[PDB]
Design a protein around this ligand. Structure first.
Ligand SMILES: Nc1ncnc2c1ncn2[C@@H]1O[C@H](COP(=O)(O)OP(=O)(O)CP(=O)(O)O)[C@@H](O)[C@H]1O
Ligand SMILES: [Mg+2]
Length: 364
């Protein structure tokens, strides 16, 4: 579980260790329900034990004529999925790796992909019901982050919905969903997943509108890099749009963590009157212009790419900004910032931080 060693970089080993090899005689294939990258997807039934009643499943298959790399990549997804056990993460029943066709057998999600489901159900849920869907997705992502798993492809199309409307993250083992630092520098983290989650929030509250659909990919690239952002969906609580914008902070360290997101959404759901104030919706607006105070020492340090010293500050008792602004340049040396260039970068930043805490602006 969390904290335990994980196997995210060895597909065959994860298949061996974390999947149940299912005998083909236990699987009954029924109607086709989708087309995947590697082959058709079916609804079916699974006998897990000789003396047990069959249970409904989804059956993902690998197309005939596959290459061995396609086979490894296909089954590798199950090796990842089998390490997870959470209400909002797709549950793996097992795989067939010994006989053709290769199969991945999962719980059946009758309502399919969330973006398609919401378009089919346009306008038919309450805002509160939509926020509960987002809470379920966030809870799954909180679990993945705690499992030190970065998803990299979080989008409404990769959330599946079952008959009880439970939303579950899938797709283990797309510029409009990807954080700026992940596109430009390939820095994928749970914080870039949080960016994606903000996009998912926008997809859900718009009932499956395509993000930045008015724009080409090249225009999306300028938008995200320069700081343009999606405008509010129609009928979107201000608290929910403000959370989207927080997920889309340019500086990844300023984005909320998934544990924070779940707590925020829980508070809103428990007091649903908090959802009644809406963000101003103007149908003529397609994009917001760029937006023009550090909460933690870690945020401040990462803003200047000095996060490698975070624990050095904490251990010495410099755990808040109001403490940091009292630091001399010799204190920085004292706690272990040895490299002169790093001393200089922190010293200069502290000057600006001291300007900030001493700023006064009282309207009369
Ligand atoms: N457990 C499940 N229950 C019900 N339907 C499912 C399902 N798993 C997959 N599907 C259906 O099959 C479709 C495609 O499945 P899936 O997303 O796994 O293919 P894929 O993973 O190859 C796309 P990509 O290559 O972009 O990751 C889904 O849109 C979904 O409708
Ligand atoms: Mg997938």
């Amino acid at each position: 579980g969390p904290g335990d060693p994980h196997t995210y970089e060895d597909p065959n080993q994860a298949v061996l260790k974390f999947t149940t090899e299912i005998h083909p005689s236990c699987v009954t294939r029924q109607k086709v329900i989708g087309a995947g990258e590697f082959g058709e997807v079916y609804k079916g039934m699974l006998k897990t034990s000789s003396g047990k009643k069959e249970v409904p499943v989804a059956i993902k298959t690998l197309k005939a004529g596959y290459t061995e790399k396609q086979r490894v990549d296909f089954l590798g997804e199950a090796g990842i999925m089998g390490q997870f056990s959470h209400h909002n993460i797709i549950r793996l029943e097992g795989v067939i790796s010994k006989y053709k066709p290769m199969m991945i057998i999962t719980e059946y999600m009758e309502n399919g992909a969330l973006d398609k489901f919401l378009r089919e159900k346009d306008g038919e849920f309450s805002v509160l019901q939509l926020v509960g869907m987002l809470r379920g997705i966030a809870a799954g992502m909180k679990y993945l982050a705690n499992m030190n798993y970065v998803h990299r492809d979080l989008a409404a199309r990769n959330i599946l919905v079952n008959s009880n409307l439970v939303c579950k993250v899938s797709d283990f083992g797309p510029i409009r969903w990807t954080a700026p630092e992940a596109i430009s520098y390939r820095k994928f983290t749970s914080a870039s997943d949080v960016w994606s989650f903000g996009i998912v929030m926008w997809e859900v509250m718009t009932y499956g509108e395509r993000p930045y659909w008015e724009l080409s990919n090249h225009e999306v690239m300028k938008a995200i890099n320069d700081g343009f952002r999606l405008p509010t969906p129609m009928d979107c609580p201000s608290a929910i749009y403000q959370l989207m914008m927080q997920c889309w902070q340019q500086e990844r360290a300023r984005r909320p963590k998934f544990a924070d997101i779940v707590s925020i959404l829980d508070k809103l759901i428990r007091a649903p009157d908090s959802l009644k104030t809406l963000a101003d919706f103007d149908p003529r607006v397609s994009i917001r212009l760029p937006s023009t105070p550090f909460r933690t020492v870690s945020e401040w340090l990462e803003s200047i790419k000095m996060q490698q010293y975070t624990e050095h500050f904490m251990a010495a008792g410099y755990t808040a900004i109001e403490k940091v602004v009292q630091m001399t340049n010799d204190d920085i040396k004292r706690i272990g910032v040895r490299l002169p260039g790093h001393q200089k970068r922190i010293a200069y930043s502290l000057l600006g931080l001291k300007d900030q805490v001493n700023t006064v602006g009282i309207p009369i």
